[PDB]
Design a protein around this ligand. Structure first.
Ligand SMILES: NC(=O)c1ccc[n+]([C@@H]2O[C@H](COP(=O)([O-])OP(=O)(O)OC[C@H]3O[C@@H](n4cnc5c(N)ncnc54)[C@H](OP(=O)(O)O)[C@@H]3O)[C@@H](O)[C@H]2O)c1
Length: 175
């Protein structure tokens, strides 16, 4: 087994109702729907009084300064957005981590065990937050998709489905 239960229905808590998280725009996120989903989410939801930064290497997806496009091109802000080495703060208070579409960018293997097929680095210690929403089908390859057992601790994880189903059910249609 792993360590989760409700899919996006859970986001509503770590997303549309989680004092402190970090939208981690991975490959799907912006190219999934998050781009405009986490966009309205980071707004209609940040207004509730919840924080939302972005936990991802400054390259989690296609180009480098691109995942910030879904944040900018959509509407979400990048001032509360931390690339990588500075994520030590985002996840320092985030009692969650909406890890949307990321995959090898969060490979906590470096945080858990270097045995991984790669070497990892200062990823975005996402599992090291309250909950975590790794939204994607399942066999997410990415640049590595290796060691990522992060989905085995306190309700922190991945929510099978498309990043478009992520914010659509939580911030766009919980119940
Ligand atoms: N950006 C650059 O210029 C650059 C340059 C050199 C190295 N890198 C490195 O490349 C890595 C990138 O990490 P990352 O997490 O962003 O990358 P990935 O691991 O490259 O991420 C791809 C992930 O997004 C998902 N995905 C793809 N299409 C999707 C879709 N249509 N809808 C929903 N999900 C989709 C995939 O899983 P699912 O199919 O399960 O969704 C996949 O696992 C980093 O280690 C980085 O340092 C980047």
């Amino acid at each position: 087994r792993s360590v989760k239960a409700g899919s996006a229905e859970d986001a509503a808590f770590i997303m549309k109702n989680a004092s402190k998280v970090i939208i981690v725009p991975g490959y799907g996120m912006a190219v999934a729907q998050a781009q405009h989903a986490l966009r309205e989410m980071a707004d209609v939801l940040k207004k509730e009084g919840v924080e939302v930064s972005y936990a991802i290497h400054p390259v989690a997806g296609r180009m480098p300064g691109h995942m910030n496009v879904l944040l900018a091109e959509a509407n979400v802000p990048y001032d509360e957005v931390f690339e990588l080495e500075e994520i030590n703060s985002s996840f320092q208070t985030a009692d969650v981590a909406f890890v949307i579409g990321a995959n090898d960018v969060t490979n906590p293997a470096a945080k858990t065990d270097p045995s991984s097929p790669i070497y990892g680095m200062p990823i975005l210690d996402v599992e090291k937050a309250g909950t975590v929403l790794f939204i994607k089908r399942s066999m997410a390859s990415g640049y590595a998709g290796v060691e990522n057992e992060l989905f085995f601790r306190n309700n922190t994880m991945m929510l099978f489905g498309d990043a478009k189903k992520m914010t659509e059910q939580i911030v766009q249609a919980m119940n």
